[PDB]
Amino acid sequence: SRVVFIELKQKGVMWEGALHDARLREGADFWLSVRSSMPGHELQTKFPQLCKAGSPDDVSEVVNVALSGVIIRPVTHVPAAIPLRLENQYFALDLSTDAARAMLDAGRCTFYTPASLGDVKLELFAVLRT
To answer: Where are the beta strands (DSSP E) in 55-120?
Structure first.
């Protein structure tokens, strides 16, 4: 299907993407493409527990509020034609109803990548449904 590349802006440990593309509210599933100085098998194993989705809409005075209902799952491949990377690891974002709605309504998504992941680089893709 059609693939929408979502530009992620890195600000230290945080990665932020704008979700204002109108096509995203019509049905989309998201994937992360990850490259790191960390060995590939280790990144596959640890990235789903190290990377945390941030709250796209928290209005509290608490810093670093997380978005619950985001399960990062390692995948063999993204089900769409995307730039190939021999050394990259791919992950699906298994979003709950509330998580998907929270990001789409806020028009934003954020991801925390700790320094333990090393020299990490993230790319976010959405595959539009039907």
So the answer is: 70-75, 89-95, 108-112
Please say whether the beta carbons of 16 and 108 come within 8 A: yes
Find the radius of gyration of the CA atoms of the chain: 14
Closest of 112, 106, 116, 129 to residue 32, by C-alpha: 112
Helix (H, G, I), strand (E, B) or coil at 38: coil
C-alpha 54 chain-centroid distance = 10
Resolution rounded to one decimal, in angstroms: 1.6
What gap in Å lies between CA 40 and CA 44, rounded to an integer? Answer: 6
Cα gap 111→51, rounded to integer Å: 7
Give the closest residue to 72 by CA, choosing from 47, 54, 97: 47
CA angle 92, 68, 126 (to 5 degrees): 30
Lookup: tokens for 8:
């992620």
- As a dihedral over the C-alpha atoms of residue 96, residue 23, residue 84, residue 112, rounded to 10 degrees, the angle is -40
Q: Which of 3, 8, 32, 33 is CA-nearest to residue 19?
A: 8
14 CB neighbour count, 10 Å cutoff: 14
- Domain count along the chain: 1
